Write a protein that holds these residues in place. Sequence first.
Motif, PDB file in Angstrom:
ATOM      1  N   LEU A 130       0.694  -0.873   0.045  1.00 44.36           N
ATOM      2  CA  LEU A 130       0.344   0.357  -0.117  1.00 44.36           C
ATOM      3  C   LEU A 130       0.876   1.250  -0.498  1.00 44.36           C
ATOM      4  O   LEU A 130       0.487   1.871  -0.766  1.00 44.36           O
ATOM      5  N   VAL A 141       0.948   3.963  -3.451  1.00 47.82           N
ATOM      6  CA  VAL A 141       0.273   5.530  -3.297  1.00 47.82           C
ATOM      7  C   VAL A 141       2.100   6.509  -2.990  1.00 47.82           C
ATOM      8  O   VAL A 141       1.795   7.527  -3.835  1.00 47.82           O
ATOM      9  N   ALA A 146       2.208   6.363  -6.888  1.00 48.97           N
ATOM     10  CA  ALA A 146       1.050   6.770  -7.455  1.00 48.97           C
ATOM     11  C   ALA A 146       1.866   8.329  -7.642  1.00 48.97           C
ATOM     12  O   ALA A 146       1.428   9.775  -8.369  1.00 48.97           O
ATOM     13  N   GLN A 176       4.057   9.424 -10.124  1.00 46.63           N
ATOM     14  CA  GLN A 176       3.066  10.012 -11.161  1.00 46.63           C
ATOM     15  C   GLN A 176       2.168  11.117 -11.393  1.00 46.63           C
ATOM     16  O   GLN A 176       1.627  10.621 -12.081  1.00 46.63           O
ATOM     17  N   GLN A 177       1.856  11.950 -10.260  1.00 45.79           N
ATOM     18  CA  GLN A 177       1.067  12.691 -10.240  1.00 45.79           C
ATOM     19  C   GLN A 177       1.469  13.766  -9.470  1.00 45.79           C
ATOM     20  O   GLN A 177       0.243  14.582  -8.229  1.00 45.79           O
ATOM     21  N   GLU A 204       1.917  17.497  -9.498  1.00 45.35           N
ATOM     22  CA  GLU A 204       1.078  18.823  -9.335  1.00 45.35           C
ATOM     23  C   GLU A 204       0.191  19.548  -8.648  1.00 45.35           C
ATOM     24  O   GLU A 204      -0.438  20.217  -8.727  1.00 45.35           O
ATOM     25  N   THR A 261      -1.040  16.696  -2.700  1.00 44.26           N
ATOM     26  CA  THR A 261      -1.217  15.322  -3.198  1.00 44.26           C
ATOM     27  C   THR A 261       0.120  14.142  -1.737  1.00 44.26           C
ATOM     28  O   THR A 261       0.250  13.450  -1.940  1.00 44.26           O
ATOM     29  N   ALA A 263      -0.191  14.499   1.589  1.00 49.83           N
ATOM     30  CA  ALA A 263      -0.905  13.011   1.811  1.00 49.83           C
ATOM     31  C   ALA A 263      -0.182  11.983   2.081  1.00 49.83           C
ATOM     32  O   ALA A 263      -0.772  11.556   2.378  1.00 49.83           O
ATOM     33  N   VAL A 288      -0.210   9.353   4.583  1.00 51.46           N
ATOM     34  CA  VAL A 288      -0.569   8.137   4.163  1.00 51.46           C
ATOM     35  C   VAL A 288       0.303   7.297   5.066  1.00 51.46           C
ATOM     36  O   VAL A 288      -0.208   6.110   5.877  1.00 51.46           O
ATOM     37  N   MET A 329       0.223   7.476   8.207  1.00 55.35           N
ATOM     38  CA  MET A 329      -0.902   6.343   9.369  1.00 55.35           C
ATOM     39  C   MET A 329      -0.386   4.733   9.038  1.00 55.35           C
ATOM     40  O   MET A 329      -1.121   4.590   9.797  1.00 55.35           O
ATOM     41  N   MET A 375     -11.296   9.357  10.173  1.00 54.93           N
ATOM     42  CA  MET A 375      -9.628  10.376   8.360  1.00 54.93           C
ATOM     43  C   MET A 375      -9.900   9.540   7.803  1.00 54.93           C
ATOM     44  O   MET A 375      -9.220  10.341   6.558  1.00 54.93           O
ATOM     45  N   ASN A 376     -11.377   9.311   7.499  1.00 58.02           N
ATOM     46  CA  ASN A 376     -12.271   9.570   6.135  1.00 58.02           C
ATOM     47  C   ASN A 376     -12.958  10.910   5.803  1.00 58.02           C
ATOM     48  O   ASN A 376     -14.366  11.202   6.921  1.00 58.02           O
ATOM     49  N   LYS A 377     -13.142  11.352   4.914  1.00 57.36           N
ATOM     50  CA  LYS A 377     -13.627  12.637   4.283  1.00 57.36           C
ATOM     51  C   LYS A 377     -15.278  13.222   4.421  1.00 57.36           C
ATOM     52  O   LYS A 377     -15.843  13.337   5.558  1.00 57.36           O
ATOM     53  N   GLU A 405      -7.621   8.488   2.570  1.00 53.14           N
ATOM     54  CA  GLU A 405      -8.509   7.384   1.857  1.00 53.14           C
ATOM     55  C   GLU A 405      -8.737   7.781   0.683  1.00 53.14           C
ATOM     56  O   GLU A 405      -8.590   7.404   0.130  1.00 53.14           O
ATOM     57  N   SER A 463      -4.884   7.747  -5.275  1.00 53.12           N
ATOM     58  CA  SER A 463      -3.771   6.981  -6.357  1.00 53.12           C
ATOM     59  C   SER A 463      -4.314   5.254  -7.132  1.00 53.12           C
ATOM     60  O   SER A 463      -3.674   5.775  -8.051  1.00 53.12           O
ATOM     61  N   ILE A 493      -4.956   7.253 -10.414  1.00 56.84           N
ATOM     62  CA  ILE A 493      -4.135   7.557 -11.111  1.00 56.84           C
ATOM     63  C   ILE A 493      -3.263   6.504 -11.461  1.00 56.84           C
ATOM     64  O   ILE A 493      -2.639   6.236 -12.930  1.00 56.84           O
ATOM     65  N   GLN A 510     -15.841   8.957  -2.177  1.00 59.31           N
ATOM     66  CA  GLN A 510     -16.860   8.762  -0.982  1.00 59.31           C
ATOM     67  C   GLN A 510     -17.683   9.610  -1.498  1.00 59.31           C
ATOM     68  O   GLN A 510     -18.494  10.309  -0.342  1.00 59.31           O
TER      69      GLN A 510
END
Lengths: 324, 346
Positions: free
Chosen positions: A226, A230, A233, A236-237, A239, A243, A246, A250, A253, A309-311, B2, B8, B11, B320
């Motif tokens: 995991l 992450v 990822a 690869q992103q 910008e 992120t 995060a 993560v 965490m 911790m989820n939105k 999450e 991720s 992506i 979500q």
Amino acid sequence: MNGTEGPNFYVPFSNKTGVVRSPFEAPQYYLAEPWQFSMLAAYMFLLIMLGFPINFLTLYVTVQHKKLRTPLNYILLNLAVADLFMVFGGFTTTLYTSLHGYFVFGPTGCNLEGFFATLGGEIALWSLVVLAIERYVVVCKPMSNFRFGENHAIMGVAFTWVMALACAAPPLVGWSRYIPEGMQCSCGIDYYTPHEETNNESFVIYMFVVHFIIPLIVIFFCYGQLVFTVKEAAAQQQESATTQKAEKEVTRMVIIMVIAFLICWLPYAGVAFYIFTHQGSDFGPIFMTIPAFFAKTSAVYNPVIYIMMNKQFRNCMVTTLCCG
Amino acid sequence: LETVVANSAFIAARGSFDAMGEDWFLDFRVLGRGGFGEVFACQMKATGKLYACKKLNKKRLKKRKGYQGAMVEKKILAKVHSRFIVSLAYAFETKTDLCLVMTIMNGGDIRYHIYNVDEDNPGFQEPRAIFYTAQIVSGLEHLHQRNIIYRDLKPENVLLDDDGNVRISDLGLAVELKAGQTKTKGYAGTPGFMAPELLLGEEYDFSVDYFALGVTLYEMIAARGPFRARGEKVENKELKQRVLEQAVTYPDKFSPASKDFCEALLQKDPEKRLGFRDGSCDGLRTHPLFRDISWRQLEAGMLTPPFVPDSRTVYAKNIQDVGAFSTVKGVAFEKADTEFFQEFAS
Ligand SMILES: NC(=O)c1cn([C@@H]2O[C@H](CO)[C@@H](O)[C@H]2O)c2ncnc(N)c12
């Protein structure tokens, strides 16, 4: 061995006071003190006070938004239920008993109480395992013909119960026995002896391998993957500043998540393993209450980590607490 | 957190793309929560191509009784494939939802792009809006040639891909009526994306689509629809009054040609609304606005608007992010419901 053997008890405190016979009905004051009971009762009170709201919230939040009632949330509901088993099987009983200064539900009570507490903790254990598996499968994409759809979700939930029963049920059929642990005001698993007559030895080996080592390997594997995913990822992103932060967060965490599994079951595993590898220990009886404290607290920290911790859940909870 | 993990996985899917059953498509984060079920991006496990999977949840379908709308969207998209109507690749069901799996439009939707361009940018630049509007018109024309009245058209149903060409989608808001029976009373479409005729339960034809086109262009430039400002979130009755009565203020942000085009459409009466005159689909095309549009290039999907989505820039919501709508309160499906669900699947 360094405690006191008996044909239905194993007090982890040495016999030299002559009252180390039958800790079921004997007042515990030959290995504990009244102040220690007040602290025990305080700790158990805490665990209820935090644990019950936390698990209620997990169930509650899904009911207020329709879309949250979906397959991928099933395992979270299961986790909350598992935790509630620990509250009513373990925490409440131990709180009641501690204030008398000994376990007052007797040998039959010990088997019952020990069953519900063990059952609880084991469903919790296997929830955490399944959760890591599901996250690994879905995100890292390593396996084909798997989804977290309704059928899969149900299977996942069912599995945690089955594995838990596979551990909690054996000491009731004389493959092991429930006997007081800690200050002898809670009932745990007998693992202090490889006592053949009750078949302890084989059970202890089974527990250590299947219910600690297996989980431990899985937890490390899944979460390692995991974190890899992450980080990759994010690379690869690049910008979004958010992120990148995060991704680091993560990873932090994930360390907390692995550590949280360790704290909960490592004490039991450690103690059990040490006595087996080298006979005798210098472990106390108050020392044996230490593993129980760590284990019981997972009813609080597991939903904190995996829900809070989820939105989506956050928004809903904030809305209801700030009038709703 | 999450949500970032979900980002991720998205992506990861994009990276693979750049280089049934729902178990044969690896599923990622939602791109919105429709009226019925999730609508997530997904990727064929055996092909390595990205598709959107518009799931329509069985429970939510029963609640609104949205069986008619589903069947319409299926049959239309199945039959009509171009470069202005999304291709349909599969139509199957699971045990929980009905699926339409359609070809990607990775660049996000026009509705998103109002706010994604920058919130301090007051809608699209005039040429860029004009290009997208022209592309919507060709799509409307293709529907009209098959004698389909679309009714509700809106920004969120105009999707961008990464080629900078747009296509209409969500054709379940349509009715197929051949010419010489187009006129017939009815109320259809979502309020604030409806024409006067529809609200009053009066006869309608292709005219309504041109009203919607006007609303769309107005929203492209001003970053608001005509029937709501930016302080309006008023109930259905007031919204209905806005649609029926108002010819709104027209910003000077508009070009004179675009201003004029908006003025004509948001003035009541189909006869005074561009397109419908004798029922022309080329009534729109006479406006000075289309001096910048070549019909041959339009039909071949070669129009290039300012800002073209990249494939290394992600467009999609977090997994979500949901709207949430009625699911069962102890309520068990009728035989009829089940029969529609099987019938849909193919
Ligand atoms: N039905 C379709 O053709 C599609 C719907 N969405 C997204 O799903 C959202 C609706 O929930 C839309 O606003 C889009 O963001 C799509 N996204 C990409 N490609 C598509 N073909 C669609």
